């Protein structure tokens, strides 16, 4: 089995997955920070 | 979905050749000019719904 | 709308009915289309130059340039169609 | 062909349509149409078989003459009290010729004669780019010029599109043709609502684009020009097929699937106004298109009865054929009905 | 009961007979390029005739 | 208890019922209005109760 | 209600992720555990129909029907195995998944407040069934009787959406609570004609009235036993149910408009009740039986006396368990010898001496035996219809005699008179068969003690 | 025609059957039938009708003891009501 | 419709005015269902590539889900903006026009007459 | 006592809950009829915000002093 070669998707590429998880971190934490700040300024638009 | 970029970016593209009252190359009045001036003066800020009326 | 406008419109519609109601020769189709296109050139010219609306005088020029680079396309497709059969 | 030049063409098609959307001047919009034709003739014909040449011609004639008729209407606008802008046409007649013109630009009832033919002639990718992208410009113009539209015309052209174009496709075993007639039906809807609440028109536009998108993309996955090809793929791999069928039912507007959403909202904002009879007159024909498409759903089963499923055609090697964004649009056209409070995001 | 059942599927067979000869409403197409093109052009000028008075 | 890993398949739907039930109990807070204000039922709030339910 | 919506949705991945050979165990187990809380659902009290959330609520009728559904899944799924018990895992998990999703949309439908949510979830209920019976139905020529079956539904079943949306924008809210209290009389004329006729015939396609009853027999002979217990134990009660609710409006209209349909159901009750006497191929008998009892239901719906509803709903539930079970008998007989034809084999009092008791017991429960819930419902319905017309009892009680005759004829010639002795296959019973039968009858006999659960909203 | 050798025998293929009958007979016969049957056997007064009995008793006793005729019809007092006019 | 409102500042995705509207909470069932929609997305991707699904879905599935939560989030925000300005427009045009929309006093059932055909 | 207190909710809770849902969907229905009235009226009057079809902008009229003869 698989004496032929390593078909490209067969073995992982650890640079790509690193970039993808990069996008996960950047995107997600950016979303959370967006939430917090919009809620904050929303609090400013009104008062206690 | 008609988009307006050219008002957003602040650039004139087709607004110059648009209507007869625009600044001409060396300003020469159009035949019906003044009446363009009054039709657009009347219909300017309104919505073409009651501008008709 | 004067007269000349009436007449040029009748030319326009002669070209258009000639377009739709004859499929025999293709060059004839493409032609009739192009003649109609000419009639549009004439209209825009006569009008614009009737109202002395100067800044818009391009409409004959820039309307006429696409009378060609589109038409040329037309004839190229005509040749590539003819060499299918005949 | 060169792998650059295709980018330097498709870039110009995108550009042209962007100009039809952006410009406030008539002569420009007319130019945008001219560029979408000029640059869309090379996309079709990509492979040099004669079918694409004759079909690309039948596109070129009616499309170009449509453009010219548009110019005629623009000029008649210039005759009657006139200036060059994008706004309500001041002539009832200019509006008439312009509704006919934009009725050729995109397939409609008197003018639909070319669409099935050209859609089967040209290849797959040209099929995608024909039935979706070029369909953005004319609606983007009609949304603008609607105030002067004579109601009776566009209502007519809409209905006759649904009746004729929808009723068609029955004997057709080809795919590209089916996609054409369905395009004409969704046309009949999008243009039906156009005068009442154009928001829904852009809605059925977008949903429709997703629909034909996943459809053709699947036809690239399993390369299939016929239903027989669909069944033979069912015995090659199942999943792509059931995606094709489920997306076809979504193309029929079946209630749980997302294709039912434009029909349903169109029925609201259609029937809160006075006329209730016309929507039903559309929904009948909608059922017609349905049980045709469900004939195409008895194209399949398991413990099948004999389809003559052949051989050689088990394969040990997966295909690498690159499918660009299939999944997002597949789930996005199946699952979307549990959304749409989101409707208003569109406008 | 065979009368009401045979009349029920005979009437539904009159709808599929109306689908059989409704395929004729599809088969009313003569598949001729000199038919739907020029007839859609003439009857299209009859859409501007009906639209001329509509 | 950690040994549920052995039985892990099973615990799912019980957590389902618990989860949905707690979602209804919270939902009542959003539906909460007219708490003492309905005409049939009016109570002077009991010394240990600021809420009927 | 949401506490009942999650656990099945969680019951989906329970199926999908699992070790092979445990799927039936896991699904059955947790599904019965659902049934417990389905039995929790009864708080219903006093006057106001309980309302769980502003989206969907439950009055009485929804509660018995719902309890019947959530009870019916585990028994259904329990029954469907050994119909196959050989396949790739994907077939099994696909099938159980489909039954699940179907149940989900059913719960949506019965609980649904607002009639458009009811309608969307309505056809969304119809699709999974279709996939079930068509994808593998044992497919005699397949008949294509799933698909244009869906056309029998939608053909006239779509325009009720039209009529609805009309009701929407005229009155505003389609919430059922506020559609109540705002309902206003609608005079008899031609517009209200096409409307009333729209909604009515739209649901009347589901519970087959004698005109349309060709719908059921083929679709129900082609159904795998799971799809059968789905179909005739529930999917008719959807039509009759929605009928129950949308008859709220149409107040005077339903008289002059009702009368022809009532006539057709009173005659077709007898006709169908007749044709089901003489047929072969047992699987059809119980089908046309369902057509008969459902005709009786429609008769009960149109005449608006409360008695009519009490007997009606009682007949929905009792006929649900009875018809369902009796189907499952037909199947348990079918695995023994592959026929579907009644007259083929015989005996089974000698052989399978226990399976007798379930044949007998179930047939009697379809014979309208006095303590049985079937006779409670049928009885009150006969009372209502006799109140409406002093004359109609000739037709009603004539249905009593015929229903007696075929209901007790099925009990024989399958089950009695000789062993055909060229068989030599049938393997005695099972524990599973007894489990299924028991799980059917035992509640149907217990309900014959405290029925006030299953009698309708008016009580 | 697969049948079984009927080594013992039950629902499914061997050695899991005992567990199968255990879960279905237990959760099916034990818990829901007996447990549930006790639940809905006596649950709180359903549809309120017991309360209806008590309230009926009290109210009737009052109606006789104070001499008012019970059950006056007229679901709403004509003292407060208005009537349309011809 | 409404293009006169938002054609004053064209191609504003959502305006500086929108921030006075409460944003959707995280756990808002909509965008969560969008996350599920990314889950079935990635599942159908792993069905497309012949790999058995639940494999490779460590990074992929998360990429999908987070992406749809992102996009769907912004979409919901601008939506709630849209209905906000809609309702505002209604009420302003209500108040500014007494004649068009009359306020009538709703008389109680004490004055009502109906037909109400009983059954029998 | 056991059943009622642990598994159910008082006719209180349910009852007033229905009072609240009837509030909600009540005022909704009302305001729906309102918006149908509004949008019904707007096409006739064209007054308010919803229906606006932009005319040509007076921003550029070129007020400048021009060739004298006239206009
Ligand atoms: C009296 C009250 C008024 C009744 C009014 C109507 C009278 C006529 C009824 C129809 C004919 C009944 C009959 O005998 O049929 C033959 C039928 C089967 O007889 P068979 O098949 O000829 O012989 C059995 C085999 O040969 C060999 O098997 P076996 O001998 O080893 O075992 C026999 C027995 C073994 O038992 C079991 O299997 C265990 C059952 C556990 C049930 C737990 C709950 O039963 C079975 O194996 C299967 C049948 C039982 C199924 C479940 C119960 C059905 C009840 C049917 C109605 C009641 C009829 C008699 C009532 C007498 C007064 C109580 O017998 C029964 O139905 C009798 C069931 C006795 C067991 C339960 C007793 C108490 C049940 C609670 C009270 C029930 C009240 C029901 C009111 C009516 C509802 C419709
Ligand atoms: C293998 C043997 C199988 C035997 C089968 C049965 C044979 C018949 C004779 C049974 C004799 C024993 C009965 C249980 C003992 C307690 C009796 C008692 O004190 O009664 C007065 C006693 C009065 O005391 P209370 O609490 O002041 O009154 C409450 C009212 O009765 C509440 O008002 P109510 O309107 O609910 O009236 C209760 C009525 C009506 O109840 C119903 O109709 C329940 C309906 C449930 C539907 C579930 C649908 C699920 C889907 O039920 C009964 O009278 C009992 C008959 C049903 C027994 C079902 C057994 C499981 C099958 O009755 C009760 O409390 C009722 C108890 C709850 C019902 C279930 C009881 C049975 C539990 C399983 C026992 C199985 C048999 C054991 C072996 C026996 C032979 C060796
Ligand atoms: C609105 C946007 C409408 C998009 C229409 C399609 C554009 C892509 C055109 C591709 C041209 C082509 O040849 O592709 C072939 C190729 C494959 O064919 P091929 O590989 O044989 O040839 C391509 C050749 N090269 C690489 C040299 C260019 O790609 C595809 O087929 C992928 C198509 C993906 C379509 C995705 C549609 C997304 C729609 C999103 C709508 C969202 C609306 C939101 C509104 C708010
Ligand atoms: C840079 C300009 C590019 C223009 C060409 C690209 C658009 C054409 C191809 C994609 C078509 C997508 C479907 C139709 C349009 C959907 C409009 C939409 O959702 O706009 C949201 C919003 C709408 O912006 P808006 O509401 O401020 O103004 C546009 C008004 N409409 C479209 C209703 C006439 O777009 C943005 O926020 C863009 C930033
Ligand atoms: C209603 C809202 C529903 C959600 C709409 C938003 C869609 C967002 C895009 C989803 C992209 C999913 C994705 O990236 O899938 C991964 C896959 C390729 O995997 P990747 O991790 O990129 O690595 C390559 C290794 N094979 O990807 C691919 O193979 C295709 C990559 C696609 C790239 C284009 C993505 C466009 C994103 C912006 C879309 C905005 C739309 C907003 C309007 C929606 C209106 C309905
Ligand atoms: C969570 C784990 C999900 C496990 C998915 C299934 C794993 C697997 O191996 O699936 C293989 C199967 C494809 O097998 P194949 O033979 O190709 O079948 C195609 C026939 N249609 O592919 C599949 O089965 C497709 C994937 C099925 C996914 C099922 C749903 C998973 C759970 C999410 C839904 C529930 C969300 C609940 C939310 C809370 C309640 C509100």
UniProtKB/Swiss-Prot annotation, chain C:
GO terms under biological process: ATP synthesis coupled electron transport
Membrane topology, record value: Multi-pass membrane protein
Enzyme type, top EC level: translocase
Subcellular location: Mitochondrion inner membrane
Catalytic activity annotation: a ubiquinone + NADH + 5 H(+)(in) = a ubiquinol + NAD(+) + 4 H(+)(out)
Single GO term (MF): NADH dehydrogenase (ubiquinone) activity
Amino-acid biosynthesis is among the record's keywords: no
Keywords: Electron transport, Membrane, Mitochondrion, Mitochondrion inner membrane, NAD, Respiratory chain, Translocase, Transmembrane, Transmembrane helix, Transport, Ubiquinone
EC numbers, comma separated: 7.1.1.2
Pfam families according to UniProt: Oxidored_q2
Entry keyword annotation includes Transcription: no
Listed transmembrane segments: 1-21, 29-49, 61-81
InterPro entries (alphabetical): NADH_UbQ_OxRdtase_chain4L/K, NUOK/Mnh_C1-like
Gene3D superfamilies (alphabetical): 1.10.287.3510
Cellular component aspect of the GO annotation: mitochondrial inner membrane; respiratory chain complex I
Quaternary organization: Core subunit of respiratory chain NADH dehydrogenase (Complex I) which is composed of 45 different subunits.
Membership in a protein family: Belongs to the complex I subunit 4L family.
Role according to the record: Core subunit of the mitochondrial membrane respiratory chain NADH dehydrogenase (Complex I) which catalyzes electron transfer from NADH through the respiratory chain, using ubiquinone as an electron acceptor. Part of the enzyme membrane arm which is embedded in the lipid bilayer and involved in proton translocation.
UniProt-recorded name of the protein: NADH-ubiquinone oxidoreductase chain 4L
Lineage, uppermost ranks: Eukaryota, Metazoa, Chordata, Craniata, Vertebrata
From Swiss-Prot, chain D:
Protein name per UniProt: NADH-ubiquinone oxidoreductase chain 2
One of the GO BP terms on file: reactive oxygen species metabolic process
Main subcellular localisation: mitochondrion
Pfam families xrefs: NADH_dehy_S2_C, Proton_antipo_M
Keywords: Electron transport, Membrane, Mitochondrion, Mitochondrion inner membrane, NAD, Respiratory chain, Translocase, Transmembrane, Transmembrane helix, Transport, Ubiquinone
GO MF annotations, alphabetized: NADH dehydrogenase (ubiquinone) activity
EC number annotated for this UniProt entry: 7.1.1.2
Transmembrane portions of the chain: 3-23, 25-45, 67-87, 96-116, 122-142, 145-165, 178-198, 200-220, 237-257, 274-294, 325-345
Family affiliation: Belongs to the complex I subunit 2 family.
GO cellular component terms given for this protein: mitochondrial inner membrane; respiratory chain complex I
Gene assigned in the entry: MT-ND2
Catalytic activity: a ubiquinone + NADH + 5 H(+)(in) = a ubiquinol + NAD(+) + 4 H(+)(out)
Signal peptide: none
Membrane topology: Multi-pass membrane protein
Compartment annotation: Mitochondrion inner membrane
Subunit composition and interactions: Core subunit of respiratory chain NADH dehydrogenase (Complex I) which is composed of 45 different subunits. Interacts with TMEM242.
UniProtKB/Swiss-Prot annotation, chain E:
Transmembrane segments: 37-54
Superkingdom of the source species: Eukaryota
Subcellular location: Mitochondrion inner membrane
Function: Core subunit of the mitochondrial membrane respiratory chain NADH dehydrogenase (Complex I) which catalyzes electron transfer from NADH through the respiratory chain, using ubiquinone as an electron acceptor. Essential for the catalytic activity and assembly of complex I.
Complex and partners: Core subunit of respiratory chain NADH dehydrogenase (Complex I) which is composed of 45 different subunits.
Family indicated by similarity: Belongs to the complex I subunit 5 family.
Protein name from the UniProt record: NADH-ubiquinone oxidoreductase chain 5
Source organism phylogeny: Eukaryota, Metazoa, Chordata, Craniata, Vertebrata
Whole-protein coverage range: 546 to 599 of 606
Swiss-Prot record, chain G:
Record-linked NCBIfam families: NDH_I_M
UniProt-listed Enzyme Commission number(s): 7.1.1.2
Sorted UniProt keywords: Electron transport, Membrane, Mitochondrion, Mitochondrion inner membrane, NAD, Respiratory chain, Translocase, Transmembrane, Transmembrane helix, Transport, Ubiquinone
Full protein name: NADH-ubiquinone oxidoreductase chain 4
Annotated GO MF terms: NADH dehydrogenase (ubiquinone) activity; ubiquinone binding
GO CC terms: mitochondrial inner membrane; respiratory chain complex I
Catalyses which reaction(s): a ubiquinone + NADH + 5 H(+)(in) = a ubiquinol + NAD(+) + 4 H(+)(out)
The organism's place on the tree of life at top rank: Eukaryota
Family: Belongs to the complex I subunit 4 family.
Localization (cell): Mitochondrion inner membrane
Any Pfam family the entry gives: Proton_antipo_M
Function recorded in the entry: Core subunit of the mitochondrial membrane respiratory chain NADH dehydrogenase (Complex I) which catalyzes electron transfer from NADH through the respiratory chain, using ubiquinone as an electron acceptor. Essential for the catalytic activity and assembly of complex I.
Membrane topology: Multi-pass membrane protein
PANTHER family to which the protein is assigned, alphabetical: NADH-UBIQUINONE OXIDOREDUCTASE CHAIN 4
Subunit field text: Core subunit of respiratory chain NADH dehydrogenase (Complex I) which is composed of 45 different subunits.
Bilayer-crossing regions: 22-42, 60-80, 98-118, 147-167, 196-216, 224-244, 256-276, 284-303, 308-330, 351-371, 391-411
Protein's UniProt keywords contain Electron transport: yes
